Amino acid sequence: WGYGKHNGPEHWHKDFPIAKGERQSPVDIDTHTAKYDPSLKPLSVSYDQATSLRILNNGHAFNVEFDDSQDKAVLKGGPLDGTYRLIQFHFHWGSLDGQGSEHTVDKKKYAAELHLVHWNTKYGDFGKAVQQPDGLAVLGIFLKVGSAKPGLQKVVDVLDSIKTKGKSADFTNFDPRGLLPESLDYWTYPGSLTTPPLLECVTWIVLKEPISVSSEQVLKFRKLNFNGEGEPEELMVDNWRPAQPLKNRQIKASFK
Ligand SMILES: Clc1ccc(OCc2nnn[nH]2)cc1Cl
């Protein structure tokens, strides 16, 4: 599977029939229809003790991985019950600044989207968590092109060392707090992974406020390769799934 004409999102259902399921992601967020939920508790992003380890090009995106063997960096509150441990983050992005995000906001596409992936510690390990309807919480953050994001630059600068599929590099002492916007206002809904296996195991928390990154920063994302070393070059761009049918779901807002 991938993102090309011959193996992309319109093909995925043949090996992963849940691609046409009842709670697939991403979705369009219609801001006029999303409703404030006074019931949501405050969102708690607790990343002070986050321990990054490594950055990996897996042929689909690049992943920054964390030590999740203890409750270091966790996401709690909001729509969530219990404690979700940060395991990794990655992005999806476009070939052009007008596309690249997976979620859309009133059909608007952002240049990219950051996903911080967390798993529900009541299920003991990540593999067990993805088999549960409330196994994962993904914090989604839009990127728009404007001023540079200082906290992203250490990521940008290491991409030259993981150009191709299968390459990894040490990536210790990175603080993911530098990737967040000022506001934690969010939308939330029940959904799925946005790549195969497309499991319906995600509580989505999508921040309303985008972060700005510079044109130079996202240009360096676009120099990555889907291919492995020694293979014909396939630029890693447009690694996003389009919006899926909302079906029997309501998107809730944390804010008035
Ligand atoms: Cl660990 C991980 C890495 C990448 C990935 O991409 C698809 C995606 N993004 N947000 N939800 N699913 C999924 C996961 Cl669960």
Ligand code: NA
């Ligand atoms: Na759920």
Ligand SMILES: [Zn+2]
């Ligand atoms: Zn993602």
